[PDB]
Amino acid sequence: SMNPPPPETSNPNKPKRQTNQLQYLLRVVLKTLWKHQFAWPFQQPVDAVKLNLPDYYKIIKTPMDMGTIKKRLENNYYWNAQECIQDFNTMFTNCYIYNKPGDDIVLMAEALEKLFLQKINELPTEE
Numbered sequence: 024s025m026n027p028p029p030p031e032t033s034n035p036n037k038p039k040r041q042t043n044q045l046q047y048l049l050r051v052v053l054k055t056l057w058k059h060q061f062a063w064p065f066q067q068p069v070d071a072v073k074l075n076l077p078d079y080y081k082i083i084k085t086p087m088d089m090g091t092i093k094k095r096l097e098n099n100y101y102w103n104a105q106e107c108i109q110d111f112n113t114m115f116t117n118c119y120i121y122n123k124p125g126d127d128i129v130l131m132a133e134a135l136e137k138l139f140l141q142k143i144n145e146l147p148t149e150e
């Protein structure tokens with residue numbers, strides 16, 4: 024079996040910014056979720072080979088994970104906060120699409136998403 028290439032984390036011709044909202048997404052949102060006891064399954068791309076999930080990338084066509092988001096933030100990949108917020112939401116949604124209600128991994132995603140929502144609620148105004 025085979026994993027796909029990971030999502031892009033580097034693209035020199037993509038225009039970039041470092042904004043206070045993006046700084047918040049790294050220093051508050053990503054850091055909060057990353058240190059959580061349920062973060063570990065989401066800290067890298069889904070390894071469909073190791074996890075024996077041969078249908079994962081048949082079902083999930085827009086993969087995302089916090090390892091990728093971390094790299095994107097640290098390497099200033101984004102133009103705006105909404106891009107990054109979309110990546111987090113893609114990660115959660117993928118989990119809910121692929122798995123079943125009440126599954127351990129879904130409970131984990133739900134706990135992380137609750138924290139995510141609380142932090143994004145207080146996203147600072149620009150400038």
Ligand SMILES: CCc1cc2c(n1Cc1ccccc1)CCCC2=O
Pocket residue numbers: 064065069074076117118121122127128
């Ligand atoms: C069907 C198994 C599974 C599905 C998934 C993951 N696992 C492996 C896993 C499940 C529960 C707790 C930790 C890892 C981790 C990555 C994200 C995901 O949707």
